[PDB]
Structure formats: C-alpha cells, structure tokens
Ligand binder design. Structure first.
Ligand SMILES: C=C(C)[C@H]1CC[C@@]2(C)CCC[N@@H+](C)[C@@H]2C1
Ligand SMILES: C=C(C)[C@H]1CC[C@@]2(C)CCC[N@@H+](C)[C@@H]2C1
Ligand SMILES: [Mg+2]
Ligand SMILES: [Mg+2]
Ligand SMILES: [Mg+2]
Ligand SMILES: [Mg+2]
Ligand SMILES: [Mg+2]
Ligand SMILES: [Mg+2]
Ligand SMILES: [Mg+2]
Lengths: 304, 304
C-alpha cells in the first residue's frame, strides 16, 4: 500500500554493511536454525539493517551491541509463537538472571550463552548504561506472554499494552546506550508524553506491515503463542472494514502522531524545557519512527 | 477541513424550495420558538433542505411528510440538550403513545399536537408504510436519553449505539415511505449489512462536521443532555490525538465505508439478489450518505 506523505527523513548508520556482515555471521555460527531456508530467511530479514535505521547516530563502537540484542530478541519473538503462554514465560524467565549475569549459561544452549556473552560485553563497555537496559528488556519479555493477549482489547487498551510488547522502553534505553546519551531522571520525566506518542507510531507501523505474516502465524502456529494481537485486526473489527482498509486508516493516524511529535517537541522548547541532551533524544525518537517505517516496507520478513 | 475524494454524487429533490417554505412556515406558525433570533437560526439551518438531500427521489406529494418529521425531531434533539437524562426520557416517552395515535394531544402544547397531526396525516396518506416508521422512531428516541451515553465507549461500541441515536432505521423507513417503495421482509434482510455500513457513514460524517457545535453545547448546556457523544471525541481519546486529527482520520474511514457499500451492492447484484426494489433502495442509501455530507459541510447549523 502507498504510504501517506511524511516529513520524517529516515537515516541509516554509516557502518550498516560492515556491522550486518559481522552480526549476521555471528548468529549464523552460533544460533540453531532448523534448516537452510531459515538461515536464508534470517539474513534476508536484515535485523542489523533495522537496528541501523533505528539508531543511525549511534557511536561506531557501540552499534554492533544494539544489532546483537535486537537480533536475538527478534529470533526469540518468533520462537514464542510455537509455545503456550506458560512455556513462553518459562523460556523468557530463564534468560533473565542470565541477562543480569547472576547465572552462568548452559553453553550447549545457544540462546543462553549468546544472551550471557552479549550482556557481559555490554557491561564491559559501559556498565552504567548497560544496566539501564535490563529492566526495560525484562518488561518487554514479560509482556510477550501476558495473558492479556488472549483477552478482547479496544484500540486504547491495546496501545497501552503494546507499549511494553513493542519494547518502547528498551528501545529508548538502548538508543541512549548506543549513543552514549545520558539523561537525568528529570529530563526523562519531561519527555514522557513524547515517548507515549512515539510508542503508538512504532506499534501501529509495525502492525500495518506485519499483518499478513501474523495472520498466517495465527492459522498455523500455537493457539496461544500465535494469537493475532494487532491494531489492524482491532480497527477492522471495531469499524467493520477489511484489514486492508484498516491499514490505510491507521497509516493516516500514524502521520497524525508524527504531527503530534513535532508539536510536543516545539512545545518543549517553547516552555524552555529543552536541554541539549533532550534535543538529541527526541530527534533520536524520530529516527526510530522513520527508520521503523523504511525497514518495515522493504524487509522480506513482512513481504514473504 | 478538506474532505478526501468521493465517487458519491449528491442529489436534491426538485421541490426543495417550495416545500421548505411550506414546512418552515408551519413550524414558524405553531412551534414555540423563544425569540426572533431562534426563529432566524431555525430557518438558516435548512432542515427541509437536508431532508430533500436525504430523499431526492421521494414522491412529490410525500416529501413534505419527511420534512416535517425530520424538522420536529431536529427541534426536539436540541431541546434535550438542556434537560437531564430523566427529563429527556419523560419528554420523549410522552410523545410515543401520541405518535401511535393512542393518546390525544394537549392542544395547548405545540409539540404534542404537531406530533399527533403529523402521524395522523401520514397514516391517512399511507397507513401501512407510516406504521413501519413508528418503532424505528421510538428506538431512536430512547437512545437519545440512554445512560450508555454517559458511560465509557470504544469506537465499535459507539457505532453500535449511534446507529440508534442517528436514527438510521427511521431514516430508512421514512425513505421507503416517501418514495412509496415497499420491500418484503426477505428483501430487507438481504441488505442488512449494507444498512449497518451506511449507518456508520451517516454517523461519523455528522460527528465530523457538528463537533464544534457539540463541544460548545457540552460546555454550556446540561451536563447530561448536552454530553459530548461523538466518534471524534472517542477516537481522539483512544489514539491520544486532537479532535482535528481525529476528524481527518475519521473522514478517510468514511471513504472506506463508501468503498464497502459499493462492494456489498456489487456482490448483491452478482448473486442475482438485487431486485428492482433493492436497486432503488441501495441507491437511496447512497443519496442519504452523499446528501448528508453536502448539507453538513454547508449548513449554518454547524458553521455558526
Ligand atoms: C526485537 C525487539 C528488540 C523487540 C522491540 C522492537 C520491535 C518491536 C520492532 C518491531 C519488530 N519486533 C519484533 C521488535 C521486538
Ligand atoms: C432527527 C432525526 C430525524 C434523526 C435522523 C436524521 C439525522 C441523523 C440527520 C443529522 C442530524 N440528526 C439529528 C438527525 C437525527
Ligand atoms: Mg512477532
Ligand atoms: Mg512480538
Ligand atoms: Mg508485528
Ligand atoms: Mg518514505
Ligand atoms: Mg444533536
Ligand atoms: Mg442527537
Ligand atoms: Mg452531531
């Protein structure tokens, strides 16, 4: 479908090609793929490409960390579709003390030592900023198997939940880590509304492009893990239109959230509340929204 | 507010002007308007014009009946805004047996004898078709003061409620009455989906244009009777955008309903289920949709 006009200019990290080869190559060696078709599909998705589109102004020696984290969480996200909520929760909860470093990984299990080595290397580079990503990640991981996915949801309730399932906080903390962007608790508190608005944009844009994939998943995967949980289906139900019609309407709403983002940012400066770090932060949020769109509309993950 | 492209072409009844003078003249003579400013505002609204846009193919000697019914229901609709739900209910329930003709009107009370004389004359012209408007009107009347108006609603739940509050069913029965268009129970059951889709279009288009009037009413009139009940406010809540942003998204949504209307009619025709009566009926529904939009975007009722 044709995207409505956007004033957001998507940016990609300069080292995207080098880092993609580095991180793809890593997972191709360590991760247990079912077959050659899955290995090809993994590379075709371009998980480091979306990361570089998400954080184009990340520091050169930190971008690979973000690519590794997003890549493994992508792989797990698909893995959970074949599990019940109970099995999926146990799977995630196992990785949490390992992510903290409190528990050694079983080195015969790829997901365990990949997660462990990753978080160790991140704390080794920047202990303080790496630690601030932990809880936001665990927040996301626990939302993935929340029983609310099996409950009827309206648009408002969905977006409220999706802020965790889309991993808004983890993306924010990881962006700051990758850019070395440090913010006071006061600064963080100032941009709450901007965060909330950005979350809806990320969520719905993903919903729009990943619908066909998730519809197939709902028909073939686990009854619980593969459950269809998206704004596309919700708006289609609520407004009595096709999923395609819902996509077109939702895309216009996304552009309204872009307009709101700009107004909130301009208001932040007008109220004299904008700091140099905050200016870089809200600009970074814009890159996430536009980077998420560019990748979603081009990745084979959603088109095939 | 620029409306998205539409293929629906509006049509107005040829006798719109002379019928307007006849019907406006009647109400100016009988209705208890508080002052001259209110009388001028009443004429400026063009209640017979929107009726003639709703039913452009009504029979020449029946269009005035439709203009009278819509006019008196328009006037009551505004009246209810200064009442509580309880007062509004008692006001409406009083008119229901009078509409049936089971209870005689108090001739000293304009609304009572206007309602009585109207339905009596409509029954005299076409007894059967007039009776089939009764219950749909009563359903609309009771929805006007329903306490669900003051309780939390999502988009879907609102559209389901608004179908009664927008009087979709009475508008259909009135259209058939005015055109002398008789349909069998079987025939009406075949276009139920088309009716439901049409209702959402009428509702939201009205919501979009009448928002400024209703926002002001909610701030100035009775906190119950004048309560803000509109898709504009609801979508603005769910998506956390301005009312203006909600309008733009809702208008695109209206175009999807127009597209659905065309698909449903085309399928009805392809299945060989589109009788001559149904073809006129579904065309009549389109006139209601395009006619509602034309009047809404030009009437002084919403612009002043
Ligand atoms: C892989 C992640 C880090 C999470 C957060 C980021 C995303 C919402 C972006 C869209 C795709 N989903 C799978 C991921 C899931
Ligand atoms: C007053 C009526 C006859 C109903 C049916 C017709 C309308 C939907 C037209 C828009 C305004 N509303 C108030 C009315 C409500
Ligand atoms: Mg997923
Ligand atoms: Mg997921
Ligand atoms: Mg998705
Ligand atoms: Mg673009
Ligand atoms: Mg009203
Ligand atoms: Mg009303
Ligand atoms: Mg209105």
């Amino acid at each position: 479908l044709e995207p409505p006009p956007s004033t957001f200019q998507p940016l990609c990290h300069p080292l995207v090609e080098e880092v993609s080869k580095e991180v793809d190559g890593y997972f191709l060696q360590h991760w247990n793929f079912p077959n050659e078709k899955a290995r090809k599909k993994f590379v075709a998705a371009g998980f480091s490409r979306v990361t570089c589109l998400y954080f184009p102004k990340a520091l050169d020696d930190r971008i690979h960390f973000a690519c590794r984290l997003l890549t493994v969480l992508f792989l797990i996200d698909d893995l959970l579709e074949y599990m019940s909520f109970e099995e999926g929760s146990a799977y995630n909860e196992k990785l949490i003390p390992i992510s903290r470093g409190d528990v050694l990984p079983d080195r015969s299990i790829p997901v365990e030592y990949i997660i462990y080595d990753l978080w160790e290397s991140m704390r080794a580079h920047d202990r303080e900023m790496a630690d601030e990503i932990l809880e936001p990640v665990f927040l996301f991981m626990r939302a993935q198997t929340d029983r609310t996915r099996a409950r009827p949801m309206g648009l408002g309730g969905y977006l409220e939940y999706r802020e965790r399932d889309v991993g808004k906080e983890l993306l924010a903390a990881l962006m700051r880590f990758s850019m070395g962007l440090k913010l006071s608790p006061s600064e963080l508190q100032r941009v709450r509304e901007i965060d909330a608005n950005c979350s809806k944009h990320l969520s719905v844009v993903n919903d729009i492009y990943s619908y066909e994939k998730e519809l197939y998943t709902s028909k073939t995967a686990h009854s619980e893990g593969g459950i269809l949980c998206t704004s596309v289906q919700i708006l289609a139900q609520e407004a009595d239109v096709t999923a395609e019609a819902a996509k077109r309407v939702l895309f216009v709403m996304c552009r309204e959230w872009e307009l709101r983002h700009q107004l909130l940012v301009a208001r932040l400066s007008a109220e004299g509340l904008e700091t140099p770090g905050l200016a870089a932060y809200v600009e970074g949020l814009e890159y996430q929204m536009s980077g998420n769109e560019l990748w979603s509309q081009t990745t084979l993950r959603y088109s095939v």
